[PDB]
Design a protein around this ligand. Structure first.
Ligand SMILES: *[C@@H]1O[C@H](CO)[C@@H](O)[C@H](O)[C@H]1NC(C)=O
Ligand SMILES: *[C@@H]1O[C@H](CO)[C@@H](O)[C@H](O)[C@H]1NC(C)=O
Ligand SMILES: *[C@@H]1O[C@H](CO)[C@@H](O)[C@H](O)[C@H]1NC(C)=O
Ligand SMILES: *[C@@H]1O[C@H](CO)[C@@H](O)[C@H](O)[C@H]1NC(C)=O
Ligand SMILES: *[C@@H]1O[C@H](CO)[C@@H](O)[C@H](O)[C@H]1NC(C)=O
Ligand SMILES: *[C@@H]1O[C@H](CO)[C@@H](O)[C@H](O)[C@H]1NC(C)=O
Ligand SMILES: *[C@@H]1O[C@H](CO)[C@@H](O)[C@H](O)[C@H]1NC(C)=O
Ligand SMILES: *[C@@H]1O[C@H](CO)[C@@H](O)[C@H](O)[C@H]1NC(C)=O
Ligand SMILES: *[C@@H]1O[C@H](CO)[C@@H](O)[C@H](O)[C@H]1NC(C)=O
Lengths: 235, 261
């Protein structure tokens, strides 16, 4: 996130940080007591050794990991979507399993999944989160950043993104003048949209041309299409 | 980039491009492993030694332009054998522009239902992992199959307006059927809510008897396991219109304040 402010502790009890080799690389979202949902392009080529992925739940600041609210866990299974294609950047979604269960606390809560035949109308503000970068050519952010971006239509996004092929499994979000959008280092970041006092999972950060650019929105994996594929593993 | 291409049964053994010494950088090869109609592919790697995550081998099961993904292998180590499901397998080698490794070497074979073990007949239920459990783990409260398929959905809604609404359609071993509410309590209510992946039991009430199938009588027990007997002896049956709310979804329960800034 480049155009957002710091988040309050406990504001996003589902956004978790995935560390690969003592370094934050990708983000995920708590959906169950032992399962996660993240982008497949960041775990592409690392699903062979799930033990190298340590999930940090309830993370607020990247410098305070010994806090009692933080509950670290280890990954034992990484499932990449079968329809994924790194070249076309389509179906960019993957699930990661936890070794031990995590007790739901005041700072750790699972995110909600959009039900079947539930479409989000364009022009609707959906909040984002993640420990991304505050600028394109810079460094990461120690505090959990968050912002709010409005949704766009597939036709308008395809018209504004000619370098890519926006399929029906993608949902875009961003401002016309830019400035407020996610950037690199925040892969797998959720596109959280409130719906009747509930924050659904309306999108997983898939890719993007360039952040903080006018008329260059960010593309998110439409989770409403992969609802049954995610629920198949939650059982 | 311009290495080998589609092969057939007489041509199984193939290197990547220069497996004896090392593969070049920025390579993008493809080995479309064809077969006969109804014969899958079993790709066994005789040797595998590549670079880190930056160099991977993507194995697909396309059969058309809508290709799927089977496995992504990288790094040195003996990789598992990939079992296809169609008569076409696409192997993509994506390499970086530095630190070139040796390569790999694999040969495939055709057959019928390779990988998937032979399902045992004569009333033997086979879960997704292949383990056989005839009646010892057929939705009874055990975990014989390690993949969790032995506890598959033996209960679901029926004629429901929204997602979290419907009937009490159950299934003991094979046949699906509804249930009655002669001794319906909140305990079994929240039990069947949790079994369907829902929250706490809400207001549930019948309307009128309409289904004549083998209805079941749900009973409670102090040990935790539910005892149900699908007996066809009941008058003025009550079809439970199960209306149960969702689980504890992403509701911010922290002590956040109000600040429109
Ligand atoms: C972690 O949080 C505690 C809370 O008081 C603070 O004292 C400490 O300085 C923090 N550590 C870092 C590295 O920010
Ligand atoms: C979580 O809840 C279980 C069940 O009450 C309890 O045994 C356990 O101590 C709790 N904490 C952890 C870290 O599992
Ligand atoms: C979305 O948020 C922007 C500011 O970030 C605001 O100007 C706009 O009115 C909001 N849209 C809706 C529909 O609330
Ligand atoms: C996007 O892909 C679809 C599917 O092949 C194709 O029909 C369409 O013409 C493509 N659009 C662009 C702009 O490449
Ligand atoms: C196997 O490869 C040889 C060498 O190119 C070729 O002549 C032969 O036709 C191939 N066998 C097939 C395609 O079944
Ligand atoms: C690949 O070659 C090895 C070496 O003999 C062989 O054991 C294996 O069966 C081959 N894989 C096939 C035929 O799928
Ligand atoms: C469900 O709806 C179908 C639609 O015709 C009807 O035939 C059936 O009797 C209904 N079942 C119940 C239990 O209402
Ligand atoms: C409920 O259980 C009791 C247990 O004896 C039984 O007599 C009764 O017929 C059942 N049904 C109703 C509607 O009470
Ligand atoms: C049942 O659902 C309704 C829906 O608004 C809710 O108001 C009510 O509190 C729920 N009752 C219980 C017992 O959960």
């Amino acid at each position: 996130i480049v155009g957002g402010s710091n988040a309050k502790e406990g504001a996003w009890p589902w956004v978790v940080g995935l560390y690969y080799g003592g370094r934050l690389l990708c983000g995920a979202s708590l959906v169950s007591s032992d399962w996660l949902v993240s982008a497949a392009h960041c775990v592409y080529g690392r699903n062979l050794e799930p033990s190298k992925w340590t999930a940090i739940l309830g993370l607020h600041m990247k410098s305070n990991l010994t806090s009692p609210q933080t509950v670290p866990r280890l990954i034992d299974e990484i499932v990449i979507n079968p329809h994924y294609n790194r070249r076309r950047k389509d179906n960019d979604i993957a699930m990661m399993h936890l070794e031990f269960k995590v007790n739901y606390t005041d700072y750790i809560q699972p995110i909600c999944l959009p039900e079947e035949n539930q479409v989000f109308p364009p022009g609707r503000n959906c909040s984002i989160a993640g420990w991304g970068t505050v600028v394109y050519q810079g460094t990461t952010a120690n505090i959990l950043q968050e912002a709010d971006v409005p949704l766009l239509s597939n036709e308008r996004c395809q018209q504004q993104m000619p370098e890519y092929n926006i399929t029906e499994n993608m949902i875009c979000a961003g401002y016309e003048e830019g400035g407020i959008d996610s950037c690199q280092g925040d892969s797998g970041g959720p596109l959280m949209c409130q719906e009747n006092n509930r924050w659904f999972l309306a999108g997983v950060t898939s890719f993007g041309y360039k952040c903080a650019l006018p008329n260059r929105p960010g593309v998110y994996a439409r989770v409403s299409r992969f609802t049954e594929w995610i629920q198949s593993f939650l059982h | 980039c311009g290495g080998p291409f589609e092969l057939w049964e007489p041509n199984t053994t193939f290197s990547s491009t220069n497996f004896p010494n090392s593969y070049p950088n920025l390579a993008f090869c493809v080995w479309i492993l064809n077969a006969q109609k109804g014969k899958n592919i079993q790709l066994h790697f005789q040797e595998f030694d590549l670079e880190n995550i930056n160099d991977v081998v993507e194995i697909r099961d396309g059969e058309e332009a809508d290709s799927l993904l089977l496995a992504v292998y990288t790094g040195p180590g003996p990789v598992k054998d990939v079992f296809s499901t169609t008569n076409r397998m696409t192997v993509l080698l994506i390499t970086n522009d530095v630190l070139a490794r040796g390569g790999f070497k694999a040969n495939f074979t055709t057959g019928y239902h390779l990988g998937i073990p032979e399902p045992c007949k004569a009333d033997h239920f086979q879960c997704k992992n292949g383990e056989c459990v005839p009646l010892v783990n057929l939705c009874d409260g055990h975990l014989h199959c390690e993949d969790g398929s032995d506890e598959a959905d033996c209960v679901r809604f029926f004629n429901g307006t929204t997602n979290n609404n419907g009937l009490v359609r159950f299934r003991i071993q094979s046949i699906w059927h509804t249930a009655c509410a002669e001794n319906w309590t909140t305990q079994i209510s929240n039990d069947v809510c949790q079994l369907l992946g829902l929250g706490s039991g809400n207001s549930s009430k019948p309307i009128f008897p309409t289904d004549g199938g083998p209805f079941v009588k749900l009973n409670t027990a102090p040990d935790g396991h539910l005892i149900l007997t699908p007996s066809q002896q009941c008058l003025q049956d009550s079809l439970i219109r199960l209306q149960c709310n969702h689980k504890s979804c992403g509701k911010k329960l922290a002590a956040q304040d109000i600040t429109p800034k």
